[PDB]
Amino acid sequence: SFVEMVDNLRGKSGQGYYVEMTVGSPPQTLNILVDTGSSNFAVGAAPHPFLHRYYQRQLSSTYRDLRKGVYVPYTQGKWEGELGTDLVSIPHGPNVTVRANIAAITESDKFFINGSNWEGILGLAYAEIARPDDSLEPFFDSLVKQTHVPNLFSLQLCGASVGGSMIIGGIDHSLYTGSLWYTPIRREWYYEVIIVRVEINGQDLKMDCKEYNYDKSIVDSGTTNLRLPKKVFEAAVKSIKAASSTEKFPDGFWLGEQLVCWQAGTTPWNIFPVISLYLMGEVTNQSFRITILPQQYLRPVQDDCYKFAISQSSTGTVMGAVIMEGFYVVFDRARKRIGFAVSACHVHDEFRTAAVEGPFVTLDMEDCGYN
Numbered sequence: 020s021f022v023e024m025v026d027n028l029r030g031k032s033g034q035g036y037y038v039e040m041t042v043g044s045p046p047q048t049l050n051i052l053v054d055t056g057s058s059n060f061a062v063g064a065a066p067h068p069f070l071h072r073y074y075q076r077q078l079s080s081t082y083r084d085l086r087k088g089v090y091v092p093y094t095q096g097k098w099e100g101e102l103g104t105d106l107v108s109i110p111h112g113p114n115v116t117v118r119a120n121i122a123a124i125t126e127s128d129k130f131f132i133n134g135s136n137w138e139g140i141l142g143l144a145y146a147e148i149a150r151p152d153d154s155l156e157p158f159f160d161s162l163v164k165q166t167h168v169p170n171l172f173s174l175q176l177c178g179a180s181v182g183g184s185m186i187i188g189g190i191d192h193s194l195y196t197g198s199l200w201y202t203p204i205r206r207e208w209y210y211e212v213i214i215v216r217v218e219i220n221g222q223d224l225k226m227d228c229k230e231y232n233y234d235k236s237i238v239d240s241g242t243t244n245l246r247l248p249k250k251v252f253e254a255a256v257k258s259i260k261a262a263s264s265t266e267k268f269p270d271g272f273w274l275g276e277q278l279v280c281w282q283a284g285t286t287p288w289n290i291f292p293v294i295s296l297y298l299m300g301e302v303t304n305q306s307f308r309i310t311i312l313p314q315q316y317l318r319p320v321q322d323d324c325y326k327f328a329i330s331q332s333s334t335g336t337v338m339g340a341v342i343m344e345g346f347y348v349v350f351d352r353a354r355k356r357i358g359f360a361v362s363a364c365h366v367h368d369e370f371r372t373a374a375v376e377g378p379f380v381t382l383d384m385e386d387c388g389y390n
């Protein structure tokens with residue numbers, strides 16, 4: 020826990036959450052995007068049309084070239100650069116400094132966002148998925164080995180300019196309500212979790228739970244949308260369309276292309292269903308569920324306009340930022356589990372409310388994992 024980290028995140032809708040950091044000696048200040056979806060710490064180290072500032076290794080008396088190149092291809096977007104180490108600090112985070120690996124981005128393609136206000140990315144996932152390989156120790160691992168910071172972190176992403184919190188090394192009880200529920204981390208590469216059941220407005224999607232994790236399911240703060248495997252994505256949309264069949268929208272809308280708008284304050288929330296994702300529990304045949312309100316999957320962009328924030332994937336399910344916004348998520352690395360609880364900045368609806376409920380019986384949860 021810690022008072023000093025409570026409102027340490029910012030960013031605008033659909034463009035990621037970032038924390039302030041400093042690299043080099045003297046300290047160079049940079050806004051770094053918090054990404055539990057990757058494992059590389061990387062910062063712009065050269066001019067780019069979208070960067071307002073960048074890491075200047077020549078001005079840091081502590082920079083050390085590892086004389087190895089590196090590149091990372093993301094779902095959408097990629098960068099190239101040079102590996103080296105330097106001292107790093109999180110002003111509104113723990114009170115320590117550590118020497119961490121840093122990828123000085125020299126070239127990039129569809130990575131940096133125009134007007135996002137962040138110049139780097141902090142991959143908080145495990146080494147197993149780092150570039151060039153798992154031998155490049157991720158930032159957090161370094162932080163944990165060099166300091167006393169406990170091996171754990173929590174994220175409170177709030178919807179809207181946007182804000183939130185990253186509690187390095189603990190859980191701040193003032194950021195959530197109710198009980199914290201934990202789902203195991205299936206394997207330590209991405210923050211993989213196993214989905215056991217899916218319901219739209221109470222109706223079971225009735226699919227083979229293996230489909231929910233076809234390939235895999237991960238908790239990715241680096242991704243905006245809820246990403247679903249083809250088959251699941253088609254079932255969901257079909258169900259969501261029917262629920263709101265009272266009104267008609269263009270195919271481009273469901274594809275995430277063109278947005279939809281309603282006269283200010285007249286958004287028909289009631290016609291959009293809630294989605295419940297049941298996750299594997301900590302006890303035998305026991306699971307729990309988190310419920311997403313349409314306010315979460317209809318991202319805001321005169322009138323009120325929104326973008327359907329659920330899209331199909333060919334790389335498994337991705338519990339993106341919109342899924343995380345209604346809750347307080349605990350990345351308990353130390354106990355290989357992830358916790359969910361209603362967030363202090365929860366979403367609102369006079370008649371409906373996002374939730375984290377348990378316990379639930381769910382037989383054969385193991386058969387839900389993909390192989």
Ligand SMILES: CCCC(CCC)S(=O)(=O)C[C@@H](NC(=O)OCc1ccccc1)C(=O)N[C@@H](Cc1ccccc1)[C@H](O)CNCc1cccc(OC)c1
Nearest residue numbers: 034035056057058092093094095096130148241242243244
């Ligand atoms: C900040 C939110 C940007 C969105 C809005 C853009 C209009 S996004 O689009 O949701 C970002 C997503 N992109 C996305 O979801 O793209 C979908 C898409 C749309 C159109 C065409 C192709 C793909 C994504 O790639 N995220 C990675 C972080 C990142 C941050 C900022 C810029 C580029 C990347 C994250 O690390 C991926 N974690 C799984 C992963 C996957 C593969 C290899 C990995 O390496 C360890 C790891």
